[PDB]
Design a protein around this ligand. Sequence first.
Ligand code: M7F
Ligand code: M7F
Ligand code: M7F
Ligand code: M7F
Ligand code: POG
Ligand code: POG
Ligand code: POG
Ligand code: UDP
Ligand code: UDP
Lengths: 429, 427
Amino acid sequence: TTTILMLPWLGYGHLSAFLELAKSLSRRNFHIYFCSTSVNLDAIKPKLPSSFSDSIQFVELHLPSSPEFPPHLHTTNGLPPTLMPALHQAFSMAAQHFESILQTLAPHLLIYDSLQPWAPRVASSLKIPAINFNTTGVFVISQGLHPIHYPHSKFPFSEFVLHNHWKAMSTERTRKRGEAFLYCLHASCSVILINSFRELEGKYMDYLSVLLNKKVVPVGPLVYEPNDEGYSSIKNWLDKKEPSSTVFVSFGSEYFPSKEEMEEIAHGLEASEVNFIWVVRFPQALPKGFLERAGERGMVVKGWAPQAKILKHWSTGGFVSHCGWNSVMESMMFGVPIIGVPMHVDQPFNAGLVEEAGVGVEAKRDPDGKIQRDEVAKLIKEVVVEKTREDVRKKAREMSEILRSKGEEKFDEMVAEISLLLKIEHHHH
Amino acid sequence: TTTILMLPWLGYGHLSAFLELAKSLSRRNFHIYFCSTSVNLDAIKPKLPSSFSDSIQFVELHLPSSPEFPPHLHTTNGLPPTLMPALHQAFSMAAQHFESILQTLAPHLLIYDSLQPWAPRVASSLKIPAINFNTTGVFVISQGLHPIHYPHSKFPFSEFVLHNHWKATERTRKRGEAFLYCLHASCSVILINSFRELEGKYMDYLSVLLNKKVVPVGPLVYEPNDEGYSSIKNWLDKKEPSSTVFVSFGSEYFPSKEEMEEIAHGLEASEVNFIWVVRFPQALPKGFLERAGERGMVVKGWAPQAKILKHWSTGGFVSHCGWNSVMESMMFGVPIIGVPMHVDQPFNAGLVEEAGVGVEAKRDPDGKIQRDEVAKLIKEVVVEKTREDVRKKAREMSEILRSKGEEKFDEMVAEISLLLKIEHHHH
Ligand SMILES: C[C@@H](CC[C@@H](O[C@@H]1O[C@@H](CO)[C@H](O)[C@H](O)[C@H]1O[C@@H]1O[C@H](CO)[C@@H](O)[C@H](O)[C@H]1O)C(C)(C)O)[C@@H]1CC[C@@]2(C)[C@@H]3CC=C4[C@H](CC[C@H](O[C@@H]5O[C@H](CO)[C@@H](O)[C@H](O)[C@H]5O)C4(C)C)[C@]3(C)[C@@H](O)C[C@]12C
Ligand SMILES: C[C@@H](CC[C@@H](O[C@@H]1O[C@@H](CO)[C@H](O)[C@H](O)[C@H]1O[C@@H]1O[C@H](CO)[C@@H](O)[C@H](O)[C@H]1O)C(C)(C)O)[C@@H]1CC[C@@]2(C)[C@@H]3CC=C4[C@H](CC[C@H](O[C@@H]5O[C@H](CO)[C@@H](O)[C@H](O)[C@H]5O)C4(C)C)[C@]3(C)[C@@H](O)C[C@]12C
Ligand SMILES: C[C@@H](CC[C@@H](O[C@@H]1O[C@@H](CO)[C@H](O)[C@H](O)[C@H]1O[C@@H]1O[C@H](CO)[C@@H](O)[C@H](O)[C@H]1O)C(C)(C)O)[C@@H]1CC[C@@]2(C)[C@@H]3CC=C4[C@H](CC[C@H](O[C@@H]5O[C@H](CO)[C@@H](O)[C@H](O)[C@H]5O)C4(C)C)[C@]3(C)[C@@H](O)C[C@]12C
Ligand SMILES: C[C@@H](CC[C@@H](O[C@@H]1O[C@@H](CO)[C@H](O)[C@H](O)[C@H]1O[C@@H]1O[C@H](CO)[C@@H](O)[C@H](O)[C@H]1O)C(C)(C)O)[C@@H]1CC[C@@]2(C)[C@@H]3CC=C4[C@H](CC[C@H](O[C@@H]5O[C@H](CO)[C@@H](O)[C@H](O)[C@H]5O)C4(C)C)[C@]3(C)[C@@H](O)C[C@]12C
Ligand SMILES: C[C@H](CO)OC[C@@H](C)OC[C@@H](C)OC[C@@H](C)OC[C@@H](C)OC[C@H](C)OC[C@@H](C)O
Ligand SMILES: C[C@H](CO)OC[C@@H](C)OC[C@@H](C)OC[C@@H](C)OC[C@@H](C)OC[C@H](C)OC[C@@H](C)O
Ligand SMILES: C[C@H](CO)OC[C@@H](C)OC[C@@H](C)OC[C@@H](C)OC[C@@H](C)OC[C@H](C)OC[C@@H](C)O
Ligand SMILES: O=c1ccn([C@@H]2O[C@H](COP(=O)(O)OP(=O)(O)O)[C@@H](O)[C@H]2O)c(=O)[nH]1
Ligand SMILES: O=c1ccn([C@@H]2O[C@H](COP(=O)(O)OP(=O)(O)O)[C@@H](O)[C@H]2O)c(=O)[nH]1
């Protein structure tokens, strides 16, 4: 039995995408060691059906621990942003435990995320072949690598323009971050895997492959679908609404919008008169009277909501989303138009790809980089409340039809590449 | 590797349901020998993706052959109804070749259909455990078995009444004895293509009446990925959403000229868009296609039923209510307009109506189809959509069925595991 150890970065969206990939490999008769910190393994375990537990086994990675940084903070999920430097420093210090895990389990293959340059170095030292898996889409990576080779040329194959707000958000420190990220891709054996699909990003995949001089293999759409978490009361509330009348509002697992940002979002929801379910979180807030004036149109869920189940409900007509890639992939699969309110990292590029595909719209920031309640209201009105953007709704339906038609063949290329790589390395061993 | 030989009855609907069940066992690491006549194996091979061919292997069963009854007629698909006695007799005579196949391949398990009492007998003689798999739903079986045990009491848990057209001695008893033997002879359990949200109380009742465990393995529904589709798709793409009915009477029925006349006039009066599969043995009123214009399309011989039912333009399914077609329509959320023809179909239409995911065009007292019934129901369900209730339940049923996954086969796999562990001891 061929064994693969999988090492996602310590973020919930990363663990989620890796676990969907783990199931696909389990269905192809691989045995999977799924390796993360205990707090992340606990968070993702409800997403693993019991039928997989014989072939997908959780392996705890130990980070350095202190009473000031204890194991329940060894995740980006709800982490105070100012502990991100500590979290990254401790993850890099896990390389010795990770070496011991690889020596004990001796897996045939390592699949690793793009935030751990040490991981393919440890694997190589044990003669364990290793492949990089990216849980972003392709667009953002191609946009970052293009200016390195073509500093005086516009990015081709897109009219996307990154807002000045993110253009400025020591160039030497920024360079070293990019060198570590690219090393993870560059070090990958023969191919890199990425959670995307050609109908959406084929031209960018081909370009990235030319730029990196490595084959890019899509393995998406990777989308978790559950089989209470508070859904019983949420479903009963959604059941009282008209079809396609409600927006779900969420900024993912590792972002806390500021008070000023929440004000613009809240006033936008209010002016649109939409029904809304809004997940509000606080690290491990709303205008006075906002909920009271919303009345039965609004619901705030504290901490966490059953995102997939809400997006699949017949009452849901829109998704006000930070445009994290898993959330975008879910919304496309479920056919819910995205109203993009991107915040940072890959999100503004994801919102631009959503907009260019015609399956969603982006709420634009003002020149000073602030969210605009007027934009948010206008786009919710057009996409959900009055539905004058029938073009967006049609493209969203058509994309979901495309994504629902994909099956296990989406993994054929990855499996063939893994097979070839292990047969070659067995010779060289 | 545990091996299973599967022996459907020689009908396309049966091979279809058996192949979907074969795929589910293959994903559970069984090796499948899929056994049927060559004409049937040829017909079903497009529905088997290449990824399965290493673990689902086709095995040819030979029936007796003659120039008057050659191998391309060894199927009910498009077969002249007056050759059905010959096909059944030929299938019985295949029991010898079937024994040789079981001896050669030595499968660990036989799964067999309900039209071959000799099959579990051959398996038993070779000490091969055998399980019956039914490609109907359960309602029809419980309705047939109930009056045997309760001749003076009405069937419970349903108000369905079988029209006198289908109501109307020793030969009938002998047919029922052979069918029930297939179920009764099954080892430990019978398998059936159904699911509890739709037929739970009937499964429980059948299990009591047969004194055997009934294990559901449904919904079993083929979904594809040309065969004419590219042109049909371009035609559907020009229609309004949910505006079009697909019309089909399955693989082994040819409606009479009289029936075709009533269906045709019902379609015309409704002013619905329609795609209608019309077949001739291995027809329409004069001017009907002309007057229909671009509203109607006749497809000769065969159509990509699943792709059509899944299209955004399809709002209804005028169906003979064969069980695979009912299961597909429920899975895809398309309301059924039932025009059942024979065998289990009037019972299936009754269950559809009871569940509220479709409606049944009722026949006249003398058994004739009524063009006014067909037109009225198409108008109410598809064209005017005043039966919002039917469309909603169809949608809610589609969501239920889409929520099911690989767990629907857990009970079957566990029973198979137990049965083989027991019989390994005894042999
Ligand atoms: C800084 C360097 C690695 C940083 C890490 O360091 C590692 O640390 C040690 C211990 O930790 C490890 O043990 C490793 O040994 C050591 O890593 C080695 O680092 C050397 C360079 O120091 C590589 O040579 C060698 O391979 C690699 O192993 C880090 C973060 C851990 O410190 C990065 C890795 C990805 C990479 C190679 C990119 C992406 C891909 C490349 C480009 C430049 C040019 C090429 O691209 C081609 O250029 C043509 C002209 O335009 C195009 O025509 C064509 O299209 C395009 O393909 C290429 C594919 C090589 C490019 C943009 C380079 O600028 C800079 C590179 C950014
Ligand atoms: C691989 C690289 C990713 C870079 C890409 O980003 C990613 O891109 C998205 C795709 O779009 C992804 O999906 C992720 O979401 C997104 O990642 C997030 O990005 C946001 C803001 O951008 C952060 O807020 C958040 O935290 C981070 O996770 C990028 C920037 C190219 O885009 C990661 C980022 C953090 C980082 C730089 C750490 C931490 C700090 C560094 C170390 C190595 C050495 C240095 O650190 C050493 O240690 C101490 C630091 O002070 C000092 O003592 C000493 O001087 C120094 O040597 C250094 C500072 C460079 C170290 C351990 C590196 O190996 C590996 C790095 C892990
Ligand atoms: C198991 C039984 C199924 C009976 C059930 O039906 C099924 O129920 C649905 C579920 O709802 C299913 O899904 C199927 O669609 C539906 O099936 C179809 O039903 C329609 C009309 O309803 C036919 O048009 C069509 O053909 C048939 O497939 C039923 C009736 C209970 O409902 C089958 C049907 C035919 C039959 C009776 C044959 C053929 C003929 C018979 C033999 C056995 C012995 C006899 O043979 C004679 O033996 C004599 C010596 O004793 C000789 O004198 C003589 O020469 C010889 O003929 C006999 C005539 C009874 C024989 C070989 C039997 O083993 C097995 C039988 C195979
Ligand atoms: C006619 C007979 C089989 C015909 C075939 O023959 C086979 O042919 C030989 C070679 O071909 C083979 O070698 C087989 O040996 C030989 O088959 C044997 O045939 C005898 C009876 O001759 C059985 O005894 C024995 O098991 C079985 O092996 C064939 C091929 C000719 O077609 C049929 C099979 C299914 C069956 C048993 C049913 C369904 C289930 C049963 C019922 C009635 C009573 C029971 O039901 C219970 O009744 C209670 C009171 O109401 C309720 O309390 C409870 O709820 C309910 O469970 C029971 C479960 C047994 C019932 C209605 C019976 O009438 C009649 C039966 C119809
Ligand atoms: C540490 C990293 C990698 O280890 O350093 C690598 C560094 C070399 O950058 C490599 C790559 C990113 O760019 C290659 C570049 C040299 O290409 C020049 C080309 C565009 O020709 C134009 C040139 C001015 O004019 C053309 C002239 C012939 O007319
Ligand atoms: C914002 C969002 C983040 O999620 O977008 C990310 C995107 C920007 O991706 C950046 C990444 C794909 O490239 C990083 C790059 C900017 O770093 C430069 C470094 C690798 O140069 C190497 C080497 C010296 O260059 C050789 C050159 C001098 O010839
Ligand atoms: C009348 C019902 C509902 O109105 O519809 C009939 C239809 C549902 O039948 C389909 C079939 C599935 O069930 C028939 C079979 C279960 O029993 C038939 C019986 C006459 O054969 C003799 C039988 C073995 O003998 C047993 C005993 C009397 O010896
Ligand atoms: O309240 C919530 C918020 C998020 N999610 C899930 O968390 C994932 C978030 O990943 P994404 O890539 O969208 O963004 P990230 O959290 O990485 O920023 C997605 O699977 C969402 O469905 C959820 O289930 N409930
Ligand atoms: O033109 C056609 C007619 C039928 N079918 C398929 O054939 C099966 C018919 O089986 P059903 O149980 O509905 O009735 P039967 O043919 O057994 O009477 C179903 O999978 C249909 O999708 C098809 O694909 N194209």
